Design a protein around this nucleic acid. Structure first.
Ligand code: MG
Ligand code: MG
Ligand code: MG
Ligand code: MG
Ligand code: MG
Ligand code: MG
Ligand code: MG
Ligand code: MG
Ligand code: MG
Ligand code: MG
Ligand code: ZN
Lengths: 98, 24, 118, 60, 127, 87, 155
RNA sequence: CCCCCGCCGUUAGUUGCCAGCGGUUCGGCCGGGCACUCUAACGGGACUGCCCGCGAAAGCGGGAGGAAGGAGGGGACGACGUCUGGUCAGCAUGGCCCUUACGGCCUGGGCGACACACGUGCUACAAUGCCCACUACAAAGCGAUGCCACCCGGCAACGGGGAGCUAAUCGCAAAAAGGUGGGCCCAGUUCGGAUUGGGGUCUGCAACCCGACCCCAUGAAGCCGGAAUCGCUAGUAAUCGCGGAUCAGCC
RNA sequence: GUGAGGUUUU
């Protein structure tokens, strides 16, 4: 129904919300589906390792943007509550859309 | 040619289109 | 098939032989023919023999005569040194005057590999 | 200078040339980023302690 | 019409569409010589169909998305070869004697350090 | 490629034009050449850092839209030679 | 080293008329990876590969198989005093490949104004069977099996 | 053991396809699908394992066979050590001097000065190339003071809006020879090309000598090079095509 | 049964 911007640090810790709101919202009313994957925006900073005496042969450096969204089929007072009353604040910076 | 003053891709390599060959 | 100018490129396409007339180029030989109605894929030799002679006055209306603006190539260099500026001896020492490098590349206005002793 | 090149550039910034896009703790101004702030040298001796996660080694 | 065949060269999202009909070969809104016009490798597309005396009674249009052009032809040579699940894949005497059972996997190799265009590099100097 | 805004530096825009108030000596010290030379006063001598040192410039009424950027002597190029090649 | 058999250099089964022998020669005509400008010479040109040879549009090179292939020439010599390593008991694959890379520049190096003559400058030489590879088999490939002096140095 | 790649039942079904049959503006468009489709989550997923020859001893030719084969592929990866190789033009650290100073203080000039002489990037010697009707087959990073379709004023280099986006459609961009094209007719030639002094638009304190070079002026050199070099083994060269990164142009 | 115009020490 509603879009929720899911940004996690690692995809396991983003599955600590994408696999916890879902399995915390299937059992008692106003059901929920699984998360579709937003594109992992892997940045590229392929820059020189050594400070001065290093001309070529540099190492790849990435930046992984693990992002999904969970599609609920009904929001109410017992499923919007499950978005903001459970938390594992170690791999999660999420937003709620409207 | 790339390095020419005005060709097809001479606007591409140098950045902008011409005053006789516009965008559309 | 006589032309509007002086040097004849010997009976080519109207986009080609009409172009390198002095005072004429790509964006003058391209728009000077589509206004008059000549298909740009046709030949100068296969033009109408009245279009040979009536496409001559249109070129000689505004811009200054052949060789005179080529003399203004050497005269603009004269008028920029109105007090004998430094750009004048930027010009008259055989080098590009924009500010290119001149040890490597931009070997044009310099004499090609002319003078070194060692 | 070596110490107060940070405080030399903290006058009024004028306009959009001679940019003070410098590294934070040391006196570098080369290969800084608009996500790090640090440079390509300080991501080597700072982000490979574990101090700055996110960026890792991909090596695919 | 919707089959198992997904021929993916060139990161082309292959959705191949065919059933027993009347025409030889079709494409999205064109007629095999206007959309596929431009490469001679598109003059004879249906090699797995025409190779087994099953030439031209299939619709054989597509919805393929990604990359360029000739990997769609490779998505016919391999896309129909994966899309013959309607024509009973236990038929093991139709593609085995011909030199056909090598799959399209030749992808263009990636690019590395000290290098212009994927194993083109500046040379030695000795000074 | 010059535009409708003929820019002179705010450090050097109207602090060259002290002549037009009353009339004084024929020298005033400006710095820049990327800023446009002042078109208000004509015929006099304007002191400028001409690239090497502060030596003045003198117009003789030949400028209509010509750029002053061709006035910069600091490469005193005596001539060719003196290379000592193969090194 | 070199002690290993080759690769999948045999290109692909093509689809136009078969004929992988001369499609590789189209790959010798083309440059810069350009297609639909070299295949138009051999396939889409309907007036130069036929109406001049007399017959047989695709198999013009019947004459350009039997008596045109260069086969027999020296490999490589160092200071190597007076070896003359012509005979060599040469290979058919190298015999075909020297024709495929040496029957190319009788049209590129020999220009003509017309867009129907500079292409199929080669087709008359393939139909007739003449050029630079016919006198070369009499000059180079007939100086190895007649008489007795050269050198015992072989390998 | 760590992934790309070819690769699937399970796959999440905001990419969603009339593939059934649906109705539509005839883009699955729209009020249920997930049967066919990725991104990203994933566990199964052949192993010369079986056979017949070489052999006292695995090296063991080839067949079956699948996504691929006897090492499925490139890649990812870097020994004990060498060069008293180099780094203060990162950092801390020993040490020479400098602390009324090789510091800061203020904005013009310089690193792009020219007659050379080696290799490194764009790279035409032409009908097989080319200003030229043209609109497409897009792999991934980019982008809300930025991208900027459409709608513009447009001979425009580009003013001023808005359309969609706090970021996979919406828009980046054009994917390139796709052209079923008309021709440039052996040409030092619209194949080819720079330096050039005046005008018009700037993103920007400001573009000169250090804006892209935008239609203009104008187009010198070049027909494949010598004593034999040097990047390349089948998706490898080679023109073509896209974005960043400090980022205003871009050098 | 067969091979070198052939080198100088930084
Ligand atoms: Mg001429
Ligand atoms: Mg390639
Ligand atoms: Mg299924
Ligand atoms: Mg391996
Ligand atoms: Mg050394
Ligand atoms: Mg060394
Ligand atoms: Mg040293
Ligand atoms: Mg010449
Ligand atoms: Mg760019
Ligand atoms: Mg010795
Ligand atoms: Zn730093």
């Amino acid at each position: 129904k509603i879009r929720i911007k899911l940004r996690g640090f690692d995809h396991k810790t983003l599955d600590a919300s994408a696999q916890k709101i879902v399995e915390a919202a299937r059992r008692s009313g106003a059901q929920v589906s699984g998360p579709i994957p937003l594109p992992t925006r892997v940045r590229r900073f392929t820059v020189i390792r050594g400070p001065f005496k290093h001309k070529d042969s540099r190492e790849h450096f990435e930046l992984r943007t693990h992002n999904r969204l969970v599609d609920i089929i009904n929001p109410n007072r017992k499923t919007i509550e499950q978005l903001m009353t459970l938390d594992l604040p170690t791999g999660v910076e999420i937003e709620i859309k409207t | 040619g790339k390095g020419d003053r005005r060709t097809r891709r001479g606007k591409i390599w140098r950045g902008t289109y011409g005053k006789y060959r516009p965008r559309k | 098939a006589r032309i509007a100018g002086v040097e004849i490129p010997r009976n080519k396409r109207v986009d080609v032989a009409l172009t390198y007339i002095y005072g004429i180029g790509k964006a003058r030989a391209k728009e000077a023919l589509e206004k008059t109605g000549i298909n740009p894929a046709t030949r100068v030799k296969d033009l109408t023999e009245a279009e040979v002679v009536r496409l001559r006055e249109y070129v000689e209306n505004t811009w200054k005569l052949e060789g005179e603006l080529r003399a203004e190539v050497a005269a603009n260099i004269k008028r920029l040194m109105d007090i004998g500026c430094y750009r004048g001896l930027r010009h008259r020492r055989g080098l590009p005057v924009r500010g290119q490098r001149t040890r490597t590349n931009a070997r044009t206005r310099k004499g090609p590999r002319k003078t070194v002793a060692g | 200078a070596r110490k107060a090149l940070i405080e030399k550039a903290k006058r009024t910034p004028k306009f959009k040339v001679r940019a003070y896009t410098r590294c934070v703790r040391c006196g570098r101004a080369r290969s800084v980023y608009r996500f790090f702030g640090l440079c390509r040298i300080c991501l080597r001796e700072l982000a490979h302690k574990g101090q700055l996660p996110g960026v890792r080694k991909a090596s695919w | 019409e919707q089959y198992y065949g997904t021929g993916r060269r060139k990161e082309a999202v292959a959705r191949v569409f065919l059933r027993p009909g009347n025409g030889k070969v079709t494409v999205n809104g064109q007629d095999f010589n206007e959309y596929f016009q431009g490469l001679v490798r598109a003059v004879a597309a249906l090699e797995p169909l025409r190779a087994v005396d099953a030439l031209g009674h299939f619709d054989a249009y597509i919805t393929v998305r990604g990359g360029g052009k000739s990997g769609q032809i490779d998505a016919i040579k391999l896309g129909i070869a994966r899309a013959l699940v309607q024509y009973n894949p236990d038929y093991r005497a139709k593609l085995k004697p011909l030199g056909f059972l090598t799959r399209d996997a030749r992808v263009v190799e990636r690019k590395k350090y000290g290098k212009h265009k994927a194993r083109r590099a500046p040379q030695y100097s000795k000074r | 490629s010059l535009k409708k805004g003929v820019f002179v530096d705010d450090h050097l825009l109207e602090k060259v034009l002290e002549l037009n108030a009353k009339g004084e000596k024929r020298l005033i010290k400006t710095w820049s050449r990327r800023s446009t030379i002042v078109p208000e006063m004509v015929g006099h001598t304007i002191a400028v850092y001409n690239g090497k040192q502060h030596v003045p410039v003198y117009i003789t009424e030949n400028m209509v839209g010509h750029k002053l950027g061709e006035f910069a002597p600091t490469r005193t190029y005596r001539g060719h030679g003196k290379e000592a090649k193969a090194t | 080293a070199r002690r290993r058999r080759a690769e999948v250099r045999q290109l692909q089964p093509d689809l136009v008329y078969g004929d992988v022998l001369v499609t590789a020669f189209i790959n010798k005509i083309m440059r810069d990876g350009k297609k639909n400008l070299a295949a138009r010479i051999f396939y889409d040109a309907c007036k130069i590969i036929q109406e001049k040879t007399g017959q047989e549009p695709l198999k013009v090179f019947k004459q350009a198989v039997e008596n045109v292939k260069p086969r027999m020439e020296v490999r490589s010599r160092r200071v190597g005093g007076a070896n003359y390593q012509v005979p060599m008991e040469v290979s058919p694959r190298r015999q075909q490949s020297l024709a495929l890379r040496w029957l190319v520049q009788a049209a590129n190096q020999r220009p003509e104004r017309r867009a129907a003559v500079r292409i199929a400058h080669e087709l008359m030489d393939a139909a007739e069977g003449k050029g630079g590879a016919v006198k070369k088999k009499e000059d180079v490939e007939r100086m190895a099996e007649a008489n007795r002096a050269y050198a015992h140095y072989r390998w």
